[PDB]
Design a binder for this molecule. Structure first.
Ligand SMILES: COc1ccc2c(O[C@@H]3C[C@H]4C(=O)N[C@]5(C(=O)NS(=O)(=O)C6(C)CC6)C[C@H]5CC/C=C/C/C=C/[C@H](NC(=O)c5ccn(C)n5)C(=O)N4C3)cc(OC(C)C)nc2c1C
Ligand code: NA
Lengths: 182, 13
């Protein structure tokens, strides 16, 4: 209580580089949130209803390394900064929050669960401001309801002088609209 | 310009 998180690193540099090139990933996948890496950058993805969602500005058009080889994106929406792959087997898929709570939590790549007040469809305010440096690399990270259902995924931070007062996210609604579209 | 790679995960409770 309220909601807790911890992280487990599965790969190092060399293995990431190699896995990058082969497109083949034979490690077991576990957990609701995946830590993702390209050569240039690192960020997060959240599995919601069988799809692993992340941000375009992290993933680009790239495939995701998988047990059978590279997985092609199932959903690519550039204007909303959203992409998705079918979740690898073993990821714990979360469920959308329909209950309409405005009391949210953002899960950072550091496995902190931080309080957010929903201010609108795609926006929420950090109840306690954090340094920009603290949120970097957490895009694709989930925003949660108290029940632990997913409200959407972390997209961008609203910041001044390296301090972030709020966050922009991609609602599970946008995810559904992208799926019904494609 | 390769694949995105899962390098870790996060477990919720
Ligand atoms: C709506 O669609 C979008 C939206 C934003 C995009 C984008 O934004 C870029 C990328 C985006 C961003 O960095 N998001 C974050 C992030 O961690 N990205 S990241 O993981 O480190 C990453 C890097 C590897 C992916 C969550 C922020 C953390 C710290 C934050 C560090 C300081 C930067 C503040 C900036 N804030 C805003 O843009 C902002 C403030 C208020 N409003 C309404 N928007 C912002 O968050 N971003 C600018 C880059 C991009 O780059 C590529 C496509 C070339 N594509 C984007 C697209 C497509
Ligand atoms: Na923690």
């Amino acid at each position: 209580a309220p909601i807790t998180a911890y992280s487990q690193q599965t790969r190092g540099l060399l293995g990431c580089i190699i896995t990058s090139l082969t497109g083949r990933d034979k490690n077991q996948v576990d957990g609701e949130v995946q830590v993702l890496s390209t050569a240039t950058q690192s960020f997060l993805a959240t599995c919601v209803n069988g799809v692993c969602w992340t941000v375009y500005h992290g993933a680009g058009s790239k495939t995701l390394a998988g047990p059978k080889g590279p997985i092609t994106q199932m959903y690519t929406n550039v204007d909303q900064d959203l992409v998705g792959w079918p979740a690898p087997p073993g990821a714990r898929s979360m469920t959308p929050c329909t209950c309409g709570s405005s009391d949210l939590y953002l899960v950072t790549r550091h496995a902190d669960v931080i309080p957010v007040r929903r201010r609108g469809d795609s926006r929420g305010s950090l109840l306690s401001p954090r340094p920009v440096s603290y949120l970097k690399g957490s895009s694709g990270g989930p925003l949660l309801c108290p029940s632990g259902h997913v409200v959407g995924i972390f997209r961008a931070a609203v910041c001044t002088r390296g301090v972030a007062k709020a966050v922009v996210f991609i609602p599970v609604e946008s995810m559904e609209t992208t799926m019904r579209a494609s | 310009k390769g694949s995105v790679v899962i390098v870790g995960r996060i477990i919720l409770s």
